Amino acid sequence: MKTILSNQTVDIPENVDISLKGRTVIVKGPRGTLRRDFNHINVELSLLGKKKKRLRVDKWWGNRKELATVRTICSHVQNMIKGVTLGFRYKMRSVYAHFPINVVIQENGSLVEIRNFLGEKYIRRVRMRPGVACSVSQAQKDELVLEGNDIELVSNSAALIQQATTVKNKDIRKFLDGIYVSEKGTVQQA
Amino acid sequence: MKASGTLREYKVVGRCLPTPKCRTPPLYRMRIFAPNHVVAKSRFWYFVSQLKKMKKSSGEIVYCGQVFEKSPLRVKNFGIWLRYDSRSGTHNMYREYRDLTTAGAVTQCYRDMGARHRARAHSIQIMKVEEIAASKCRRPAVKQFHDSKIKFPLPHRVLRRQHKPRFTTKRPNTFF
Amino acid sequence: QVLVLDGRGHLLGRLAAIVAKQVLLGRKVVVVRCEGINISGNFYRNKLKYLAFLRKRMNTNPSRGPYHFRAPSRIFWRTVRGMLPHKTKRGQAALDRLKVFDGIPPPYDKKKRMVVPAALKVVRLKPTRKFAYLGRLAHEVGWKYQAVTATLEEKRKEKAKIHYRKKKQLMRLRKQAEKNVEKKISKFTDVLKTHGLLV
Amino acid sequence: IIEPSLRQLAQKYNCDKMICRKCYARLHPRAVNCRKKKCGHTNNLRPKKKVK
RNA sequence: CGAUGCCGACGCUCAUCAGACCCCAGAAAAGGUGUUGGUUGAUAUAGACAGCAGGAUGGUGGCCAUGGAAGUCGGAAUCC
RNA sequence: CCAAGCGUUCAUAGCGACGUCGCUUUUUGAUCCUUCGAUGUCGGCUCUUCCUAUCAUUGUGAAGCAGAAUUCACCAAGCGUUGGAUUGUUCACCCACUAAUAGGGAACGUGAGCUGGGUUUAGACCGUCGUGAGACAGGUUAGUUUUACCCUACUGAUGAU
Ligand SMILES: [Mg+2]
Ligand SMILES: [Mg+2]
Ligand SMILES: [Mg+2]
Ligand SMILES: [Mg+2]
Ligand SMILES: [Mg+2]
Ligand SMILES: [Mg+2]
Ligand SMILES: [Mg+2]
Ligand SMILES: [Mg+2]
Ligand SMILES: [Mg+2]
Ligand SMILES: [Mg+2]
Ligand SMILES: [Mg+2]
Ligand SMILES: [Zn+2]
């Protein structure tokens, strides 16, 4: 049954500055500027509140499927507020039994070379997504640190450098090797 | 039956035939919804024959009148007690509607069992219609209109009369 | 004396079904920009739908059986040809009035072109339903001149934006001459106002 | 040979899943219905056998 | 292809194999947290459903039947 | 499909009784609808294309997947699936190689394409049956395989608008 109104409301903090050209929410803050066009959802985004303390989304006459697109939007806008005010840090470890996974960062973080994965001679080169800066960290024997503003980019480049290192034609229950995302977090704390 | 047009709301009474034994039998009122009195008397006999040991030949129709609405200018909440058959079994139901007339809400119930359950007009058997207070309704599709300050926009006004300007210069507008 | 229909935003079978009647009514129709036409239903579905058409060839000599035109203009022409008696000299004469194009060639680039609101996608298609561009679909089913039509289209939009600015200018002048002259057109304006032409 | 906490990661991804007895899909641990259209989103799942 | 080029009514339905009208020209058992509508039964400010701990033991390692099965391999038991 | 059991344990890794629901027309039947002023009736050889119910190869999911080998399943018919002893064989069987030596269709593809070993005229032999002439999905041997120059299709060759 079509519901008359279904709406939510993200609460912007005073530190962020947000505007929208229709369904194109642009969010500017301490770390950058992120824009995510929502022209494929058919809702009403209102930048209500003076000084724009909050953003309110409305779906009028929406079936059950379209009522889902409400909280999805309100969660992407809060993941842009978060990735613009704090950042996205995808700390990830490397698990190897015998052959050490020798990883190296080129191009100032926009490319990763993985050598000696399972003692192979193929050097996996993985181009990062534009905006995602990988860097070997310290205090941890073998791990990487991915950093960025857009969670879709950070998480997808982590899925790229995780799926690149997969075991083939073996028993993936015994051959537990790879570069797995251990911790999802933020650049600066809160 | 066939729920043609809009159904009227008929009040049919009828009695068995007088005999030497029962010098006068009891009258039996029913509350039929049908296109016209000719179909209303036939559903009166369908029902009376399914309840009492009484047939159209063995009886007579004492009165078949249309009962109008007592407030056709007040939006009401009608609740109906269906009884219908599917391809496998027969089920009782209870459906609610917002309408102005009782026969209106019953027409909307025939078109609703037709839409949702593909039940032809002859499988359905209305057994009780009752105007319900807004605080006794159950279906959330009907409770949602019980608001005093209701407010909503018509958001995607698709252009009708697509063929009067059939060949036009400007493109259609849907925001209004 | 001619219809110039912009194919952008229109549905394929609805545009065809409407063109194939004016053409049969002795009216010369020119469908332009046949790569803006978009069919309903998700892309990959419409791909599998045209790939199945490609799979229907004459088994003994393919140089005879169904011809599968890969351009959007000729796909539209081919689908209008299904709504015509193209095996009679009044359906061949019909088809001889249709004239389909990709992009807007320069006979019709400088011409106001009509629209059929009985076949548009915004009008005929619920907003939450997917669709497939006939241009993209022709590119992924064997159309080669998509990247050429694209540049030749942007090179046109840049040229038309100048005309539209030189016309908003010719309408600011006229909107201010209708104020410098308002003193001596004051008697010719009320007569156009008491008859609903100028209100 | 390996550390047990780094073994918990790899087991969280490679071994700790559910399998659809009807299409052998690889579903997250808290799965009740398969996600593949080729089995009918069946509710007949099992745990991914643990290695020995 | 003659006739809806009605500002036709109300809902249902997304199919990466849709559907489309007596005879009729093609399908079933069994399924689905796809979605829509119903039926019965529970609990919910004596605060629920989720979500993030503790604690599951004394008798008892119960009697039983086994090479031994100790809250967990079998069976009547099934009480504090 | 359900799931009593099998599987050290554990119904569903892989299977599965008792039942039960379907698909196909490459098995044989049932029918007799078309053809008896004739549609050349078995195989093999040659040649094309198509099916997928996948043997191998590509990319993958699952195991009672340590590796190696091997089973189950998916998208998938692009590309392959052989050389020989015996038999007229289809089928079968064995040797050898191989990645694999999967199953099929097209008037049980294909005789104006071949062959003619089998079947299936007339000659003869043996066995059983019949008093006999003769009979035998019982063995044996010898036994005429015609025509395209027409129309289409296809292959190439002129040309036509
Ligand atoms: Mg192996
Ligand atoms: Mg057992
Ligand atoms: Mg004949
Ligand atoms: Mg002949
Ligand atoms: Mg012949
Ligand atoms: Mg298959
Ligand atoms: Mg043959
Ligand atoms: Mg022949
Ligand atoms: Mg011959
Ligand atoms: Mg011979
Ligand atoms: Mg002889
Ligand atoms: Zn599954």
DSSP labels, C145-199: THHHHHHHHHHHHHHHHHHHHHHHHHHHHHHHHHHHSTTTSHHHHHHHHTTTS--
Give, for B31, the enclosing helix (H) or strand (E).
strand B28-34
Asked if residues C198 and C187 have their Cβ atoms less than 8 Å apart, the reply is no
D15 contacts in chain A (CB < 8 Å) = 172-173, 176
Query: φ and ψ at C44, to 5 degrees?
Result: -55, -30
Contacts of D25 (CB under 8 A, 6+ apart): D19, D34, D35, D36, D39
Residue C34 one-letter amino acid: C
Q: Which of helix, strand or coil describes residue B173? A: coil
Q: What are residue A26's DSSP bridge partners?
A: A19, A35
- Measured distance CA(A140)–CA(A161) in Å, rounded: 18
Q: What are residue A143's DSSP bridge partners?
A: A93
- Measured distance CA(A1)–CA(D26) in Å, rounded: 34
Picking from C128, C146, C145, the residue whose alpha carbon sits closest to that of residue C136 is C146
Q: What are residue B37's DSSP bridge partners?
A: none
Residue C115, both tokens: 């629209």
Query: φ and ψ at C52, to 5 degrees?
Result: -65, -35
The answer to whether chain B touches chain D by having 3 or more C-beta pairs less than 8 angstroms apart is no
- Measured distance CA(B23)–CA(B5) in Å, rounded: 41
Query: φ and ψ at B160, to 5 degrees?
Result: -95, -175
Query: In sequence order, which ranges of A26-174 are alpha helices (DSSP H)?
Result: 64-85, 151-163
Owner of token pair 């039940």: B119
Which residue in B141, B145, B152 is closest to A5 by CB distance? Answer: B152
B150 contacts in chain A (CB < 8 Å) = 4
For residue C188, count CB atoms less than 10 angstroms from its CB and return exposed for 0-12, middle for 13-18, buried for 19 or more: exposed
- Number of residues that this document lists for chain C: 199
∠ CA B165-B168-B173 to the nearest 5 degrees? 85
DSSP labels, C6-52: E-TTB-HHHHHHHHHHHGGGT--EEEE-TTS-EEES-HHHHHHHHHH
Asked if residues D27 and D34 have their Cβ atoms less than 8 Å apart, the reply is yes
Picking from A116, A98, A93, the residue whose alpha carbon sits closest to that of residue A174 is A98
Q: Do strands A133-136 and A143-148 pair parallel, antiparallel, or not at all (unpaired)? A: antiparallel
Owner of token pair 């057109």: C185
Asked if residues C126 and C120 have their Cβ atoms less than 8 Å apart, the reply is no
Picking from C28, C62, C47, the residue whose alpha carbon sits closest to that of residue C143 is C47
Interface test with B, best of C2, C115, C120 (most B CBs within 10 A): C115
Query: φ and ψ at D25, to 5 degrees?
Result: -65, 165
The spacing between the Cα labelled CA in D12 and the C1' in E37, in angstroms, equals: 41
- Nucleic strand E near CB of residue D15 (< 7 Å): no
Our CA-based measurement puts residue C114 at a distance from the nearest CA of chain A, in whole angstroms, of 27
DSSP labels, B83-97: EEE-SS-EEEEEEEE
Residue A7 one-letter amino acid: N
Picking from C81, C42, B132, A174, the residue whose alpha carbon sits closest to that of residue D52 is A174
Residue B95, both tokens: 């459906």
Asked if residues A59 and A43 have their Cβ atoms less than 8 Å apart, the reply is yes
- Measured distance CA(C138)–CA(C151) in Å, rounded: 17
Q: How far is the CA of A157 from the centre of ligand 5 (A)?
A: 70
Query: φ and ψ at B61, to 5 degrees?
Result: -100, 115
Owner of token pair 């259609």: B172
Max alpha carbon distance in chain D (Å)?
A: 43
Q: How far is the CA of C60 from the centre of ligand 5 (A)?
A: 21
Q: Could you give the C-alpha distances from A79 to A21, A36, A52, A175, B145, in angstroms and in order?
A: 19, 11, 18, 35, 35
Q: Could you give the C-alpha distances from A163 to A146, A156, A175, C181, in angstroms and in order?
A: 15, 10, 15, 75
Ligand nearest to the CA of A168: 1
The rounded radius of gyration (Å) of the Cα atoms in chain A is: 21
- CB pair distance less than 8 Å for A176 and D50: no
The rounded radius of gyration (Å) of the Cα atoms in chain C is: 22
Residue B153, both tokens: 């926009």
Owner of token pair 């997917």: C130
Q: What are residue A62's DSSP bridge partners?
A: A3
Query: In sequence order, which ranges of chain B are alpha helices (DSSP H)?
Result: 37-51, 102-117, 140-143
- Measured distance CA(C126)–CA(A18) in Å, rounded: 31
Q: Could you give the C-alpha distances from D52 to A176, B101, C110, D49, in angstroms and in order?
A: 13, 73, 76, 9
Contacts of A47 (CB under 8 A, 6+ apart): A18, A19, A20, A55
Picking from A103, A92, A96, A106, the residue whose alpha carbon sits closest to that of residue A154 is A92
Handedness of CA C140, C146, C147, C151 (dihedral sign): negative
- Measured distance CA(A175)–CA(A178) in Å, rounded: 9
Q: What single-letter DSSP state applies at residue A164?
A: S
CA dihedral angle for residue A69, residue A75, residue A77, residue A79, rounded to 10 degrees: -150
Picking from A145, A127, A124, the residue whose alpha carbon sits closest to that of residue A135 is A145
